[PDB]
Design a protein around this ligand. Sequence first.
Ligand SMILES: Cc1ccc(CNCCNC(=O)CCCC[C@@H]2SC[C@@H]3NC(=O)N[C@@H]32)nc1
Ligand SMILES: Cc1ccc(CNCCNC(=O)CCCC[C@@H]2SC[C@@H]3NC(=O)N[C@@H]32)nc1
Ligand SMILES: Cc1ccc(CNCCNC(=O)CCCC[C@@H]2SC[C@@H]3NC(=O)N[C@@H]32)nc1
Ligand SMILES: Cc1ccc(CNCCNC(=O)CCCC[C@@H]2SC[C@@H]3NC(=O)N[C@@H]32)nc1
Ligand SMILES: [Br-]
Ligand SMILES: [Br-]
Ligand SMILES: [Br-]
Ligand SMILES: [Br-]
Ligand SMILES: [Mn+2]
Ligand SMILES: [Mn+2]
Ligand SMILES: [Mn+2]
Ligand SMILES: [Mn+2]
Lengths: 121, 122, 122, 123
Amino acid sequence: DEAGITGTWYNQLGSTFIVTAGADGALTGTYESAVGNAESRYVLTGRYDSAPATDGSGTALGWTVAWKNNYRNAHSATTWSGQYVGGAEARINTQWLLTYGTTEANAWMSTLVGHDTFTKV
Amino acid sequence: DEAGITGTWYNQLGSTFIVTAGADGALTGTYESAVGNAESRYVLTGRYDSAPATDGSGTALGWTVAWKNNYRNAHSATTWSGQYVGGAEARINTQWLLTYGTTEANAWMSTLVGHDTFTKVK
Amino acid sequence: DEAGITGTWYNQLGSTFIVTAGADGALTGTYESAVGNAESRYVLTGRYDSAPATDGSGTALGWTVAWKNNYRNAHSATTWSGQYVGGAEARINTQWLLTYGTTEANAWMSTLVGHDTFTKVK
Amino acid sequence: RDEAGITGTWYNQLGSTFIVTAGADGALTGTYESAVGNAESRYVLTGRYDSAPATDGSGTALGWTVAWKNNYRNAHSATTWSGQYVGGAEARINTQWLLTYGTTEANAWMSTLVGHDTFTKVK
Ligand SMILES: Cc1ccc(CNCCNC(=O)CCCC[C@@H]2SC[C@@H]3NC(=O)N[C@@H]32)nc1
Ligand SMILES: Cc1ccc(CNCCNC(=O)CCCC[C@@H]2SC[C@@H]3NC(=O)N[C@@H]32)nc1
Ligand SMILES: Cc1ccc(CNCCNC(=O)CCCC[C@@H]2SC[C@@H]3NC(=O)N[C@@H]32)nc1
Ligand SMILES: Cc1ccc(CNCCNC(=O)CCCC[C@@H]2SC[C@@H]3NC(=O)N[C@@H]32)nc1
Ligand SMILES: [Br-]
Ligand SMILES: [Br-]
Ligand SMILES: [Br-]
Ligand SMILES: [Br-]
Ligand SMILES: [Mn+2]
Ligand SMILES: [Mn+2]
Ligand SMILES: [Mn+2]
Ligand SMILES: [Mn+2]
């Protein structure tokens, strides 16, 4: 929940996910990608389920980064959808979609799909 | 495209997407799904490219809904990733990922994928 | 069903899907893409549910194309996963994944996602 | 080039068993046994791979499909995997997959699951 999700996370690519979870389900923070058309930190915002099920399952969440900041614009956005899994070694397991702006002729090739797993080390 | 994106949108399922695009690149609003384990409106937040290319390319954006509100909690979240296409028939074309909370044994089946197209036509 | 799926199908991009459905679940045929790094016809192979439910549901199916023929090699492959929906205007509704060969450091950007709907027209 | 490398018996992180033969000009044929889901024993699979991959260290593109009907069960669904075979000291197949099951048109929006499987020859 709030304290478990709040903090600094790293995925398998070395990217840095700094996030604050609110009591009301909000996610806010910054994202630093180690790959792609990206430099420094980007704003992120998202939502999480603030009252998850009581059977040991994960906590559903998602967030968005638009890849524009003061240093670069990649004309694109990524959303991550996944679940937070608490425990001795907490994890956030996600799938993501990255859309970049295209003409309509090229819309068919506008979206990349992948998967990221975040840990606290 | 603050003026363009801001407003009330409907997808091909009849779901209602009410959104304000702010100066900073923020999207805020509410989502009401016509389908699924959902009732009434849900908070949404997201981001968009506030300085898109002017060469006919769409405007990249995305947003998230956690499916908990005052009526129901479906223990799930959807993110939409897409682009806004201006013109006489403005459109937001998206693909989405819906994840629901699972045990680790069942996490292989935790995520649905699909696509929604939105217009301002009621 | 066999005769339902067998034939020539077109998607919203203008691509041509020529398929034969065998009695025990086989799909074989050729694909011609109207877009991308492709020219002429490519071999496809797939599988479909040869005993679908008779409760109004679609018929699940999928197929793969590797983008190599005698004209060209694009070092990539696409898989389509969807369902055949019968009736007056038959349709095949799919989502697809296109993976191209990358180095391990670039594997994160290796796979595109999209959706194609096939009908008998165009 | 990767004909012999791809050919063999593979396992993913769920414990599923992927037995495949790669033909010299791009065909994949074999069987798939899922450790999870509405599945029992082996299912037929067919697919394609790039039989002439690029040189500068790129992986080899491939994909395959399983329809989840065999002599034991019919789950009225199909999965496609799309990914890359990577060589090296320990060969791996990294995939993303789409599982579609038959629905009514009213429910077509919830018809497709997405996930990812990584295969190796160990276990
Ligand atoms: C022909 C053609 C034309 C245009 C493009 C755009 N190409 C995408 C550009 N936009 C970025 O590169 C933004 C950074 C994304 C980083 C991802 S986000 C998901 C994953 N997880 C991480 O931590 N980093 C990665 N392509 C091909
Ligand atoms: C075996 C199994 C177990 C659990 C579930 C949960 N099943 C998802 C539950 N959560 C919802 O049902 C929330 C509403 C989502 C509405 C979607 S969001 C994307 C699309 N676009 C729209 O406008 N509405 C739809 N399943 C299968
Ligand atoms: C930055 C970067 C680097 C490398 C690549 C390679 N990229 C390989 C492209 N490989 C092809 O272009 C083959 C044809 C696929 C056509 C698709 S298949 C799915 C959809 N549906 C249709 O009918 N046609 C389309 N890219 C971007
Ligand atoms: C709400 C709702 C309604 C209907 C269904 C049907 N649900 C389709 C079931 N069809 C199977 O269960 C076949 C086995 C799939 C195994 C997968 S294939 C991809 C992954 N990788 C592996 O090795 N095994 C797994 N659901 C939810
Ligand atoms: Br790029
Ligand atoms: Br549900
Ligand atoms: Br390309
Ligand atoms: Br099932
Ligand atoms: Mn490409
Ligand atoms: Mn299922
Ligand atoms: Mn790219
Ligand atoms: Mn569901």
